[PDB]
């Protein structure tokens, strides 16, 4: 299906170890099911198990998680596609590691947004593709869309006329790549602006949307095709607003195949609206804990997860 | 007042480093106050305020020793450790211990302070410790060796003392030397860890009271013969994130004793009902609110200080 729900479940953290947290969650990626104890060791019983499309537990590696599900949605957006992943869960559950990932070929460590700009440059110039790579990096936080990547304050969204679908976001810096590795350095620079937003808007990044999107210009010639390709990398605001419910009906739309998306209730699903509404590949990585100090946090994300696209446990 | 609430916010710790988490709260121990940028800073007022660099010897002194000297004079005292889990309640409260150790907290301090003040003015004492948990409004013994994990404590009134309960079956422990608090704390740790798995009794949803019961007599030829029996609940209360029906009832409770209002509640918690003997009889009680400094826990921070002023409500005096 186009749309993939996955669920990535996260080691236990410090906080959770001096809390005297217990392990809670069972991950069984073969058979791609979430248990949750909501009662006793003893109570087998009062476990709640959920499937998805896939189930990551807390060893799975960086590039195991973009191996399953990035390398299907680049194949896509090469063909000249606009698909979007979104990292959806409770703050410190690891949707920046997730999107992001950290530094301290590839850094094992690296996460989509790096190893898709590497597989991009890798991919085009190996087939000889003519190519340019620009990437965008805004954040959304009280409704209103801020630029990290302008080298110099709110951005102004209208209505696209050549495209009822699509929506002009004003002065947005889009920053062209010139080689795999430029990516890091784009990504320090909105680090930067957004500790800067943090500090003098209380723009929080748990609080906030992060939207990064790499639009790929390509030219393919064959002795005897012009694509554009977009991915929208979104990094979404800690699941402890209305946009996040928004977002959630707009995707059990597409699965359910309803006539009436509600694009427009949300400015996040109005941004995204071109890159959801085509017959496109979309996925979400649901981040959760493992820890009984997160209970209650982790059960809202599955059953998030599951009200987006609702599939039924197999018998045992 | 013989009510004290006193905020000590902890350290950054390493996750709210690694996330390039702002400090939010800004700490004037003279001034009493604490400021929070909610972006526009919210000031609040407390009896105390120790920062970060607060070292535990010096919380003691502050908050500890006016209330013990009450104990010893023969009162019933208590100190609650109120915030968010991961602030520093159990550090406020046992503390450490290093690889007086200067990480040891409040009832390992107590206890060493007791057998130290009694045996210099030679006072004729016993010392005697209970720790329950209090979980899902049950009562859960961590000193009772011999009991199920599912046994519960049953709570019935005191005919002696309207005030009063009795906690059938409660285990007392005898405490001989100072030092022999830690083996009862480690007792009370590994029953705690068994109630957590079967029972799912999480210490960070759980209330632990702690409280040391001290028999005196002191004799004095041509003064008096005084017969006095103290007590001081240690209360490490449980997760303020939890926001159950028991922090908002001793939130009510505290109000109702601040502000001298007729009915104070007492009866609707079990948490506040055992404590009600310790509790309001004109005793010194305090509060210690613990908070993180980190812009991650900004949400709970802020509602550890608006419980903790709506507890005791201290105007700010002019900037
Ligand atoms: N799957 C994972 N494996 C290892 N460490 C992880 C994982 N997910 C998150 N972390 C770590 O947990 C912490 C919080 O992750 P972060 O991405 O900031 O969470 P979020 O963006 O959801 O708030 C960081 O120290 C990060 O390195
Ligand atoms: N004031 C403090 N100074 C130093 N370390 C602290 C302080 N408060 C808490 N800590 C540390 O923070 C961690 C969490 O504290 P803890 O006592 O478990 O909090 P709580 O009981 O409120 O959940 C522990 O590792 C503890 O040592
Ligand atoms: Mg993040
Ligand atoms: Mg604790």
Redesign the pocket.
Known sequence: KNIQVVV?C??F?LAERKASAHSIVECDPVRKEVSVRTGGLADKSSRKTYTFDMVFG?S?KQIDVYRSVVCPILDEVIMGYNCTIFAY?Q????????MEG?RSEEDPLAGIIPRTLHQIFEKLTDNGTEFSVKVSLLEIYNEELFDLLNPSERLQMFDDPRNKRGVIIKGLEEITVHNKDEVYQILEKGAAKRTTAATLMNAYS?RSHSVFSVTIHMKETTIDLVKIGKLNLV?LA?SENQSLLTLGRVITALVERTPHVPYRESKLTRILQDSLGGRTRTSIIA?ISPASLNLEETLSTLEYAHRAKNILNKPE
């Not at 703050?91 to 997730?98: E, I, L, N, Q």
Request: aromatic residues 4%; hydrophobic residues 10%; charged residues 25%.
């Open positions: 990535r996260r080691p953290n807390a799975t869960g703050t410190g559950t690891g949707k920046t590691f997730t950290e748990s990094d800690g981040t």
